[PDB]
């Protein structure tokens, strides 16, 4: 299947994360899984008119385009012209319009493409938006009703960056005849990865269960959960990040970094406003302003209170010891 | 002949190169960074630590370097204490990201152009095609596949790569365990053995680092079959055969902000004490002379950039005020890249080439302290054959063995019982300067914190130094001058332009942020 | 450092698990980390008298023996003679006596060597025992006071089998000068791996937190925690199994198999008596007979009751979906 | 000359081989399994599902096979329903364990003996040393390292390998997701490409499977450089050069219990319906004739085994009553291995060689159904050159490409929306027969459940079939006869004995359990 990978308001993190893919690695995926990577800004051999010829053929339908992967935001500034992102002689948004409409499948890889991501934070100088979402609001650049030629919406592979498996395993499924096994949530994210939470498989959930808080970074992360003092969004973030470990090693939360909720459309949450970075917003200094998904403050706090009293001794000591 | 190459890919972002070719040689060049996100604008008014999240998103390949300097900007701004272990972890992860970038860029972004038909007549062309062909090259596949290993070490300490923010004022968020360090060593050793030594060098890292002169490098290639047929040895022979040593020279003046602090010398990060604590030494090499880097001499000009401004700005007072490209081009502006310039005495504000080559020249500067990189190899190469696509590349690949050894030692240096983080005071006020050597060169953050908010946040990336457009004096940026003099055998496929731009490992997402 | 790896009442699972090692792999560990693997039953080139010469040199002190790795039980039957395990012309126990006393470090890899493991279950026909433990009781075959020449007790790398990292990372630490960073718990297990629980990082802890039970195997494991109906011992088992994933992929509990507590000295717990296999022993059908480590039934049940009432809807639905 | 080899390692457990050598040729051989754990004894009175935990611990390398048949013993005992997906997962994981065993055993346990000095005069010896030298062999390192990949697939579905018990009556515990299957395919494809095709075969699995005759195999070796210099092609040429095709013939009679049920044909496992549902066909090849396997014809003799008993026992009524080796040796007993024998009409209770070769002959039997392995290759090899160390090995390595394709298809066959488990009725009563083809051959469990307890649990492992001692009629076990006729160039280093014993991939921990 032909794959065209374009970068708009991108940092290429999803490409680099994609290149870290293992089982399959990127090379085997490109070569050994029938996925003809027509071009990629970071990997495509063609340049200049030679590259443009590939793009136009896909855009105009001269050659089939099975999967259009878009990384980065759709940059519409200035004044909706998209000239803050000029690619191959056109505003990148114009390429997105043609290629997304010519593609059998459109995959938004990374928050930028999915929802707007970091470039879409206020004041959004680049007029950035996602392909089919602007943050949580559906519609993005292509509109809510956009469907690829196979009738699917933009497949949103979120993350900042997306984990390689979140895209490669989808590509393998498409290449191995399992496109029908791919179910998408309301944000068009593959449920096989985004029905879990970042907290799912986190090494600190036991501390979270007993409301034992990581109090400090570094050696302080040898114990406790990052929810209460570092604003970890794991319980409110859908991701396999602690099920499918990053780089096959770890995750933010395992390493002691709070989940930033980067698989969720609002990322960066609160637009990294003062006091919201690596801090848990609280009411009266005790009640987190945001509770885990599906929970209410009353029951969560009541359960949290009971959990503290029942907290075992080990939950209050270092567990990730040398 | 006026030739406009759009897109010039494999430069991590959107690059359009315009050149004026006369008799097959580029006489003038314009580098057009065509994508803008305005992270500096976004960071205004944000949490002082928002750079730790945002700046890595400037770039996927070098985001950890952004994190490294973004954290150190806060460390200096907030006068934090940096436990030695945290410095080691930052150094390890910074180097590991670069160790990942070196093969990934070389095979995926640069070497595939060695299969260009312009070299079809070379006796080594077939071998180059077998090795460096995209996605099937016998050297391409393992080099790219194994390039993920160093950033596994990054992920061990940072949780993931790309997209960690685990370097925070006061140290790192993580608390590495014994298995983390042992696994990191094992990953590094495996990567060094499998790619760096077996594939790239065909010999030990120690053997390559015994090369102190260009003649040593040449003798190293011919010393034995393994080094001769190593990717490095083949690359050197291929470059000398196809002429990649003949062009891409560039400015010949270099900026290295350095990175990899000695833990004992940067426990309390300051702007003034930065240079002395560096292992990978900072240094400005201009007009054949060595100068000590001073961030105060950095200015960004936007005369030919799509930004408002009439005079160069030091990034502390720098501004990122976009102008519409349509209007900017009417004013002669042609790039979203600012034009960083360095005030070298006697030369004024001059473009400086950033990158591994800049570091190698800085490492050749005299008066190196014991903890500091002291390597005369590229001073000799620079004097012997001068800069070029090949020499610039060799500087990049020379750091693989060099950084590997540093990382391997830093992992040993870790004292796992000691602190990785000192709780800093999140001062509502502070000016911070964080700089590092991303894989592509000098990466610097100037942050101004006021009212517990980001008042100003200016990022100068290595490729902005290199690919930044002409300054107010119409002085071409380092890549633009490197492009000038580049032969163009085929105007339809101007690979030589790609070689030069990619020899800098140009990252356009970094260039503009 | 010279390594001699012997198998007593072993199944070689720890060797095979060891051979699955990655970062480092076994070959790099044997060759590239200065660890001279003198012999191994599954890998040693030598056989017959040639192999015996290596063993005797280590046993008699002719050549240095830095690390003596013992896999499998010390078989003492019949009647303490050990002839149910004859190796290289001697009862294996006799080799253990000489080599353990001649070794700078003695590593028991696997429950069999650590504590007796499966062969030590009643009626224990082979008279199996661990090197320094018999189940939880310290002393095993070598005695409680046994110390290697470096003053360390038998380093117990438990598991059935041990994960490769539990041994290789220790070997790397020894080879890289980090022997001093190795801290052992009361069972001589490396705390860097065995301060966590199997539940630490389990993908079902959220279900455990909200006391949502996996009700059936197969597709039933797409939700819930295995503690309540399948006797998962994760909360009572010290292991990194869900921190350092097995085969770099998963763990028992992530895959839907209850933790059997195979890093704990009592494994197999209850000697696999009827009703104790893949079942949670309960009192009155509601109260688990064993609660998580550090917890008491009263507070656990009280917290469990509160958790059920506060349980969010997602905790009651499939999360590990296709 | 009476030679006692102790230990004969790389046979997954403790093996001592005694041989009588006359004029450099073994005339008699005794295989002594020297380690006993008594899992069958331990399983008595235990939970009916205790075998799912205990039996895998019979062996690390083939424990999943133990789990596979242990689960099917319960499935038959409890008349369970096996959802097709569960059968697929069991088949995939059983094959994946075998796919891991094939390279791991070949390089780590068997091939290193090809570097024995007895072959120093071979023109291929130096290449054999470079490839198969322990821990440094250019083929040894990747083959062993990559042998972990198939069991990563096992771990994806079973949580871990070794030491999963995820195959339970009614199906499997696991609920594979899409990423599990796609990753499993990717791992399998990577392993097949990197080791099986590039290293072992030097060609596609399809090309190797086109070999239907011994001459095809020989032509395949010489067809091109890649296959000629592949580990397979080199191994064949090395065997023919050093004489590994000249000895190790063995009994020439084979037992294959088969495994890999077709999901639609074994949804309700029964002893009677087992053979028809097998993909890897069961079959007894004796006296040049094909027989249908019947577990009722299996008997275990302990006349020369360290167990009490006077007559062969069918494992349903089998007993594992140890006798002290000191007393047993006074009675002529010399092994902890029982002596499994199969009642072949006209031949009585005869030893049958189990293993890949046995499967290959079974696959050559006529009347193969569409889902069944129909491969005449080793019927032709058997008739052309007969069994040997080489032919036995080739049968093992022939299953790599064959099983890979099966696993690759089974992964496709998985219907991830469908059931992986049917809650069985844990009947207090039941007799179950679970059998599979572990990497080493016919692995069988006979379980008797009474009063919700394990009343009897008898395990017959493939190496017990092969390495089991003489029966009451003094008929040598398959490995003992294979050892007979083996040349012994060096009595101090009787590598030929290792070749023969290791050609069976002998697993002594399995042998005795
Ligand atoms: C209310 C509350 C208190 C904690 O201490 C705590 C600690 C760790 C995670 C969460 C929490 C929490 O929600
Ligand atoms: C008492 C109790 C009830 C549950 O439903 C439950 C579900 C999942 C894990 C644990 C439990 C538990 O301990
Ligand atoms: N390396 C790198 Fe990226 C650029 N240019 C930064 O900083
Ligand atoms: N394969 C294998 Fe092990 C033996 N023999 C079993 O069953
Ligand atoms: S990784 Fe980069 S491309 Fe966008 S989604 Fe994150 S900023
Ligand atoms: S359990 Fe983990 S995902 Fe965050 S909320 Fe606590 S650190
Ligand atoms: S920030 Fe993103 S990468 Fe995972 S740990 Fe949180 S969802
Ligand atoms: S893997 Fe085997 S060696 Fe013992 S510890 Fe478990 S039975
Ligand atoms: S959280 Fe996991 S470790 Fe067991 S007890 Fe529940 S399945
Ligand atoms: S059975 Fe053992 S392997 Fe881990 S999941 Fe439980 S401690
Ligand atoms: Mg800037
Ligand atoms: Mg038996
Ligand atoms: O970059
Ligand atoms: O085995």
Q: What string of DSSP letters covers A145-192?
A: T---TTS---EEE-STTPPHHHHHHHHHHHHTT-GGG--B-TTS-BHH
Smallest Cα distance from A31 to chain B, Å: 7
**Which residue, by CA, sits nearest to atom 1 of ligand 13?**
B507
Number of C-beta neighbours around residue A1 at 10 A: 17
Strand-pair category, D15-22 with A155-157: unpaired
Among residues C213, C121, C93, C110, which one has the least CA distance to residue C164?
A: C110
User: Which residues does D208 contact at the CB level (< 8 Å), separation at least 6?
Assistant: D201, D220, D232, D398, D401
Note whether A206 contacts C199, CB cutoff 8 Å. yes
Q: Which of D145, D151, D158 sits opposite C25 (nearest CB)?
A: D145
Strand partners, B313: B300
Ligand nearest to the CA of D440: 4
Shortest-distance ligand to the CA of residue C286: 2
D439 lines ligand 4 (CB under 6 A): yes
Which residue of B185, B193, B417 is in closest CB contact with C172? Answer: B185
Q: Does D2 touch chain C (CB under 8 A)?
A: no
Residues of A whose CB is below 8 A from D178: 169, 173, 178, 181-182, 190, 192
Helices assigned H by DSSP within D162-230: 178-191, 205-209, 214-223, 225-228
Q: Which chains reach chain B with 3 or more Cβ–Cβ distances below 8 angstroms?
A: A, C
Q: Does B152 touch chain C (CB under 8 A)?
A: yes
Protein residue whose Cα sits closest to atom 4 of ligand 7: A241
Number of independent structural domains in chain B: 1
Q: Inspect the interface and report whether the beta carbons of C28 and B412 lie closer than 8 Å.
A: no
CB neighbour class for D123 (10 Å; exposed up to 12, middle 13-18, buried from 19): exposed
Residue B212 lies in a domain: yes
CA distances from B189 to B153, B157, B402, C67 (A): 11, 17, 13, 22
Counting every residue, how long is chain C?
A: 322
Of C263, D141, D58, nearest to B198 by C-alpha is: D141
Q: Within its chain, how far is the Cα of D335 from the centroid?
A: 20
Q: Residue B371's closest CA among B401, B400, B425, B409? A: B409
CA of D507 to the centre of ligand 14 (A): 4
- Which residue from B minimizes the CA distance to A86? B34
User: What tokens does B170 get?
Assistant: 């006061």
Question: Ligand 1 centre and the CA of B50: distance in Å?
Answer: 24
* Cα(C231)–Cα(C251) distance, integer angstroms: 16
Beta carbons of B411 and B186 less than 8 angstroms apart = no
Q: Count the neighbouring beta carbons within 10 Å of the beta carbon of residue D413.
A: 16
Tokens 């085929």, located at residue:
B490
Q: Take atom 6 of ligand 7 and give the residue whose Cα is closest.
A: A259
Tokens linked to B434: 């964080």
- The answer, for A181 touching chain D at a CB cutoff of 8 Å, is yes
Cα(A111)–Cα(A266) distance, rounded to whole angstroms?
A: 9
C254 Cβ closer than 6 Å to some ligand 10 atom = no
Q: How far is CA B194 from the centre of its chain?
A: 24
Please give the torsion angle defined by the CA atoms of residues B133, B138, B142 and B144, in that order, rounded to the nearest 10 degrees: -10
Q: Enumerate the residues of chain A whose CB falls inside 8 A of the CB of residue C299.
A: 309-310
Rounded Cα distance between B221 and A188, Å, is: 53
Ligand nearest to the CA of A311: 1
CB within 8 Å: A303 and C299: no
In angstroms, what is the span from residue B481 Cα to ligand 3's centroid? 20
* Ligand 1 atom nearest A286 alpha carbon: 1
DSSP strand E in chain A: where? 2-7, 36-39, 65-71, 74-75, 86-87, 90-91, 103-109, 128-129, 133-134, 137-138, 155-157, 282-283, 287-288
Query: Does C276 contact chain D (CB < 8 Å)?
Result: yes
> Which residues on C lie below 8 Å from A209 (Cβ)?
205, 208-209
- Report CA(D40)–ligand 12 centroid distance (Å): 7
What distance in Å separates the CA atoms of residue D131 and residue B124, rounded to the nearest whole number?
Answer: 28
**Could you tell me the residue range of the domain that residue C113 belongs to?**
2-193
**Taking CB atoms and an 8 Å limit, are C196 and A203 in contact across chains?**
yes
Tell me the CA distances in angstroms from A208 to A224, A269, A283, A303, C205, one per residue in order. 7, 21, 19, 11, 10
Span from the CA of A116 to the centroid of ligand 5 (angstroms): 9
Phi first, then psi: what are they for B479, rounded to 5°? -70, -40
CATH code, domain with C21: 3.40.50.700
- Contact between D293 and D317 (Cβ < 8 Å): no
Question: Residue B485 is part of a domain; what is its CATH number?
Answer: 1.10.645.10
In degrees and rounded to multiples of 5, residue C57 shows phi and psi of: -60, -45
User: How far apart are alpha carbons C224 and C203 in whole angstroms?
Assistant: 9
Task: Give CA separation, A14 vs A28, A152, A160, C87, in Å.
Answer: 18, 22, 7, 55
Rounded to the nearest angstrom, the distance between the alpha carbon of B65 and the centre of ligand 11 is 15
Is residue B269, in this structure, part of any structural domain at all? yes
Strands B283-286 and B289-291: antiparallel
The verdict on the CB of residue D11 being under 6 Å from ligand 4 is no
Give the integer Cα–Cα distance in Å for A37 and A48.
17
Tell me if residue A39 falls in helix, strand or coil. Answer: strand
The SS3 call for residue B285 is strand
The answer to whether C142 contacts chain D (CB < 8 Å) is no
Do you find a cis peptide bond into B5, omega within 30 degrees of 0?
no
Residue numbers in B near A30 (CB within 8 A) = 135
- Check: CB of residue B65 under 8 Å from CB of residue B436: yes
Both tokens assigned to B173 = 């968020």
CB B286 within 8 A of CB B253: yes
The residue behind tokens 């390559």 is: B208
Q: Are C249 and A243 in contact (CB under 8 A)?
A: no
- Report how many Cβ contacts below 8 Å link chain A to chain B: 311
- Cα C224 to averaged position of ligand 9 atoms, centre (Å): 9
B431, C33, C250, D177, D303 from D414: Cα distances, Å: 59, 42, 19, 10, 47
Segments forming the whole domain that contains residue B218:
2-419+434-512
CB contact under 8 A, A173 and D178: yes
Judging contacts by C-beta atoms under 8 Å, the chain D residues touching residue C37 are 135
Residue D232: count of CB within 10 angstroms of its CB? 27
Tokens of D172: 């499997």
Of the partner residues D13, D42, D175, the one whose CB lies closest to the CB of residue C219 = D175
Which residues does chain C have within 8 Å of residue B417's beta carbon, measured at their own beta carbons? 181
How buried is C317 (Cβ within 10 angstroms: 0-12 exposed, 13-18 middle, 19+ buried)?
Answer: middle
Dist CA B315 CA B40 (whole Å): 11
Partners of C9 in the β-ladder:
C73
B114 touches chain A (CB under 8 A): no
- The response to whether residue A304 sits with its C-beta less than 6 Å from ligand 1 reads yes
Give the Cα separation of D502 and D500 in Å (integer). 5
In whole angstroms, give the CA distance from residue A192 to residue A184: 8
Give me the residue from D152, D182, D417 closest to A176, CB to CB: D182
Cα Rg of chain D, angstroms = 21
- Tokens 């801290």 appear where? C183
Check if A254 contacts B (Cβ < 8 Å). yes
C 28-47 residues inside an 8 A Cβ radius of B: 28-29, 32-33
Strands D339-344 and D348-350, bridge-based pairing: antiparallel
Q: A51, B19 in Cβ contact below 8 A?
A: no
Q: What is the DSSP letter of C211?
A: T
Q: Cα–Cα distance between C205 and C221 in angstroms, integer?
A: 13
Ligand at shortest distance from the CA of A250 = 7
C242 Cα nearest atom in ligand 9: 3
Q: Compute the half-sphere exposure of residue B504: CA atoms within 13 Å on the CB side of its CA.
A: 41
Residue B374, number of CB atoms within 10 A of its CB: 14
Instruction: Name the DSSP class of D317.
Output: G
Give the count of beta carbons closer than 10 Å to the beta carbon of residue C79.
Answer: 10
Cross-chain residue pair C28–B186, CB shorter than 8 Å = yes
**3-class SS of residue B98:** helix
Which of the listed residues C197, C200, C203, C204 should we mutate to test ligand 9's pocket, taking the one with most ligand atoms within 8 A of CB? C204
């Amino acid at each position: 299947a032909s794959v065209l990978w374009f970068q708009g308001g991108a940092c290429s993190g999803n490409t680099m994360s994609f290149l870290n893919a293992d089982e399959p690695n990127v090379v085997d995926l490109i070569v050994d899984f029938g996925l003809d990577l027509l071009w990629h800004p970071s990997l495509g051999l063609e340049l200049g008119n030679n590259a443009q010829k590939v793009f136009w053929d896909c855009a105009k339908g001269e050659r089939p385009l099975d999967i259009f992967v878009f990384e980065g935001t759709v940059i519409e500034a200035p004044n909706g012209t998209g000239q803050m992102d000029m690619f191959a002689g056109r505003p990148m948004k114009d390429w997105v319009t043609d290629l997304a409409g010519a593609a059998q499948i459109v995959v938004a890889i990374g928050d930028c493409a999915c929802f707007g991501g970091i470039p879409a934070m206020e004041p959004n100088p680049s007029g950035s938006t996602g392909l089919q979402f602007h943050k949580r609001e559906k519609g993005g650049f292509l509109g809510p009703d956009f469907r690829s030629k196979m009738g699917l919406p933009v497949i949103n592979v979120p993350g900042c960056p997306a984990h390689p498996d979140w895209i490669t395993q989808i590509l393998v499924a498409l290449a191995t005849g399992r496109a029908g096994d791919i179910t998408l949530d309301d944000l068009h994210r593959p449920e096989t990865f985004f029905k879990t939470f970042t907290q799912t498989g986190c090494t600190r959930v036991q501390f979270f269960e007993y409301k034992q808080s990581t109090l400090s970074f570094g050696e302080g992360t040898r114990t406790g959960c990052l929810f209460y003092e570092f604003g970890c969004r794991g319980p409110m973030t859908h991701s396999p990040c602690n099920r499918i470990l990053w780089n096959r090693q770890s995750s933010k939360t395992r390493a002691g970094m709070p989940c930033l909720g980067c698989t969720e459309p609002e990322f960066p949450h609160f637009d990294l406003a003062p006091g919201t970075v690596f801090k848990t917003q609280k009411v009266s200094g005790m009640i987190p302003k945001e509770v885990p998904e599906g929970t209410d403050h009353l029951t969560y706090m009541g359960l949290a209170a009971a959990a503290r009293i029942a907290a075992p001794q080990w939950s209050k000591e270092d567990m990730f010891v040398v | 002949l006026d030739l406009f190459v759009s897109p010039l890919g494999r430069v991590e972002g959107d690059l359009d190169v315009r050149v004026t070719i006369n008799d097959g040689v580029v006489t003038s060049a314009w580098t057009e960074a065509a994508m803008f996100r305005g992270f500096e604008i976004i960071l205004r008014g944000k949490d002082p630590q928002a750079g730790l999240i945002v700046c890595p998103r400037i770039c996927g390949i070098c985001g950890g370097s952004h994190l490294y300097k973004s954290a150190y900007a806060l460390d200096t701004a907030w006068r934090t204490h940096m436990p030695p272990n945290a410095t080691l972890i930052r150094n390890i992860c910074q180097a590991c990201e670069t160790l990942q970038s070196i093969p990934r860029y070389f095979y995926a972004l640069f070497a595939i152009d060695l299969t260009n038909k312009n070299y079809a007549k070379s006796k080594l062309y077939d071998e180059a095609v077998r090795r460096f062909a995209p996605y099937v090259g016998t050297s391409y596949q393992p080099g790219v596949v194994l390039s993920a290993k160093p950033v596994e070490v990054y992920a061990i300490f940072g949780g993931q790569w790309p997209x960690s923010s685990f370097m925070v004022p006061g140290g790192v968020m993580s608390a590495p365990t014994l298995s983390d360090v042992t696994r990191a060593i094992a990953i590094l050793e495996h990567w060094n053995d499998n790619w760096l030594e077996k594939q790239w060098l065909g010999c030990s890292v120690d053997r390559w680092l015994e090369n102190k002169t260009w003649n040593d490098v040449l003798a190293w290639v011919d010393e034995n079959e393994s080094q001769y047929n190593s990717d490095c040895g083949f690359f050197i022979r291929y470059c000398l055969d196809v002429g990649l040593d003949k062009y891409g020279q560039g400015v010949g003046n270099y900026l290295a902000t350095g990175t990899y602090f000695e833990p004992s010398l940067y426990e309390n990060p300051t702007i003034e004490g930065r240079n002395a604590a560096l292992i990978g030494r900072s240094g400005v090499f201009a007009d054949g002379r060595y100068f000590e880097f001073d961030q105060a001499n950095v200015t960004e000009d936007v005369t030919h950039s799509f930004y408002e401004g009439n005079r160069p700005l030091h990034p502390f007072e720098g501004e990122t005020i976009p102008v519409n490209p349509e209007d900017g081009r009417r004013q002669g502006k042609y790039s979203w890249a600012k034009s960083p310039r360095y005030a070298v005495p006697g030369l004024g504000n001059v473009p400086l080439e950033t990158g591994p080559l800049a570091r190698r020249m800085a490492a050749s500067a005299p008066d190196a302290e014991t903890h500091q990189d002291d390597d005369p190899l590229f001073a000799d190469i620079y004097n012997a054959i001068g800069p070029s696509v090949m020499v610039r590349q060799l500087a990049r690949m020379h750091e693989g063995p060099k950084y590997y050894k540093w990382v391997r030692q830093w992992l040993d240096d870790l004292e796992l019982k000691e602190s990785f983080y000192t709780k800093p005071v999140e001062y509502a006020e502070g000016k911070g300067f964080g700089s590092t050597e991303a894989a592509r060169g000098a990466l610097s953050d100037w942050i101004v914190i006021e009212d517990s908010k980001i008042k100003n946040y200016q990022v100068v990336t290595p490729t902005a130094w290199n690919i930044g457009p002409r300054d107010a004096s119409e002085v071409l940026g380092p890549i633009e001058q490197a492009l000038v003099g580049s032969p163009i055998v085929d105007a339809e496929d101007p690979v030589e332009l790609g070689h030069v731009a990619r020899s800098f490992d140009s990252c356009l997402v970094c260039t503009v942020h």
